[PDB]
Amino acid sequence: ATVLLEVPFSARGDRIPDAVAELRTREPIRKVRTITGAEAWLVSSYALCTQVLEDRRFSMKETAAAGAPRLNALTVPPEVVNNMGNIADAGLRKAVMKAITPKAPGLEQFLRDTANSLLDNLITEGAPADLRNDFADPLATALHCKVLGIPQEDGPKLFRSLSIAFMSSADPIPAAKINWDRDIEYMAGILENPNITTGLMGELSRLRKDPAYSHVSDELFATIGVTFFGAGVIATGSFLTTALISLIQRPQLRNLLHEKPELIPAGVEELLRINLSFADGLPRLATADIQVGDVLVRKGELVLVLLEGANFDPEHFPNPGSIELDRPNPTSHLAFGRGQHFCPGSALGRRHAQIGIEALLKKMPGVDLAVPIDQLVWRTRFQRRIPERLPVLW
């Protein structure tokens, strides 16, 4: 007597379990139990992952429905699960997306200056250094403050919400609501602050007083600030941290990208493809009975789209575990998802990683782990896989 297979499989973000490939081959859609005790369908082939992400009848919004089978507990108000739908409905899609491109004047230069300052401090303090807490995360935090138009000194307090806000918990989290409410109040104050004129919040502050947006709520404007800060900072910090691990573990690649920095974009795209940063499949609730591979998923059932399932699928990406900078299908991975909820910050995420790596490779060409890789402590019950500390020497 064995229990139903439980998800997630491993919080380790440095290697994929051999079990993923076995499952994809045997049962590319199959029943699993989530941390709440709910049943769900885990989808692990590129073909089936794409089918689900491209069929809106597998709804993100309806995962928030009272009484649904859940992957994990809500850490935001239920209506906030539909944030992107709400933005679109408010007429704000074009504005939000424009404010979060890496193309703003001075943005990339700020990013580079910031990376280089962070690295200089590490070099001045001497090895070992923690590349997550003292490089990747502060770089992500600095970036999002600039993107939002808010003071750099406000970033740390907002950042500290995230170890709780992006938990993957069986039960509601009291601290999540405390920090949510506090952070909403902060962003509402930002909208009332006359000195905030640049970035996303500067633009939202203007649109709020524009008669063309009079009936959009102050709640929605504040919510955009909190949601985009948290989602970008957690994604970019976590991705860059684990991409640095993949790089450090491949000294031939580290050396190449160091010698030929113009291959960094192709390197980063492959680091994206192999990245294990998402701790859980992407959740969707079926709004109809829908055939997916051999399974007829029924209305009301939860589906989990396993990104590394898709991204390591040999049918789509031959020699899936190898970093190859010349694949004929290099951006066709699902690291930023697909379909209606495709990542709105994908360009900014790419550029954060490219610039961080370029800067690290230049300042620390000798960068290597300062501890055996097995000594990394992987964060558990969290929506990302990340090492608590990333000790390096150089």
Residues engaged in binding ligand HEM (CB under 6 A): 60, 84, 100, 227-228, 231-232, 235-236, 239, 282, 335-337, 341, 343-345, 348-349
Of residues 183 through 242, those in contact with a copy of itself by CB under 8 A are: none
Number of helices and strands in the chain (H, E)? 15, 10
Count interface residues toward a copy of itself (CB under 8 A).
31
Contact 290, 297 (CB under 8 A): yes
364 binds, among ligand HEM, a copy of itself, none (CB under 5 to 8 A by kind): none
**Residues 165-194: x/- map of binding to a copy of itself (CB under 8 A)?**
--x-xxx-xxxx-xx--x------------
Q: For a copy of itself, which is the closer residue by CB, 321 or 366?
A: 366
Q: Does 378 bind a copy of itself (CB under 8 A)?
A: yes
381 binds, among a copy of itself, ligand HEM, none (CB under 5 to 8 A by kind): a copy of itself
Distance CA(117)–CA(204), nearest Å, equals: 30
Nearer to a copy of itself, 85 or 128 (CB): 128
Residue 233 partner contact from a copy of itself, ligand HEM, none using kind-dependent CB cut-offs of 5 to 8 Å: none
Are the CB atoms for 216 and 92 separated by under 8 Å? yes
Shortest distance, position 91 Cβ to a copy of itself, whole Å: 36
Query: Judged by CB under 8 A, does residue 367 bind a copy of itself?
Result: no
Q: How far is the CB of 2 from ligand HEM (least distance, A)?
A: 30
By beta-carbon proximity to ligand HEM, the closer residue of 60 and 286 is: 60
> Is residue 370 part of the contact set for a copy of itself (CB under 8 A)?
yes
Of the candidates 297, 223, 348, the residue with the CA atom closest to the CA atom of residue 39: 297
- Whether the Cβ atoms of residue 253 and residue 276 lie closer than 8 Å to each other: no
Cα dihedral 73, 79, 81, 84, rounded to 10, equals: -170
Q: Is residue 7 a contact residue for a copy of itself (CB under 8 A)?
A: no
Structure tokens at 328: 């004929």
Name which of 18 and 326 has its Cβ closer to a copy of itself. Answer: 18
Binding partner of 221, given a copy of itself, ligand HEM, none, CB within 5-8 angstroms per partner class: none
Instruction: Say if strands 302-305 and 39-43 run parallel, antiparallel, or are unpaired.
Output: parallel
Closest C-alpha to 200, from 86, 345, 335? 345
DSSP tag of 127: S
DSSP string, 134-189: IIIHHHHHHHHHHHHT--GGGHHHHHHTHHHHTB--SS--HHHHHHHHHHHHHHHH
Residue placing its CB nearer to ligand HEM in the complex, 208 or 341:
341
Please, what is the minimum distance in Å from the beta carbon of residue 287 to a copy of itself? 30
DSSP letter, residue 133:
I
Q: Which of ligand HEM, a copy of itself, none is residue 174 near (CB under 5 to 8 Å by kind)?
A: a copy of itself
- What are the angstrom distances between the C-alpha of 338 and each of 280, 282, 290, 334? 16, 11, 18, 6
Measured distance CA(321)–CA(149) in Å, rounded: 39
Residues lying near a copy of itself in the complex (CB under 8 A) are found at 126-128, 163-164, 167, 169-171, 173-176, 178-179, 182, 370-372, 374-375, 377-382, 388-389, 391, 393
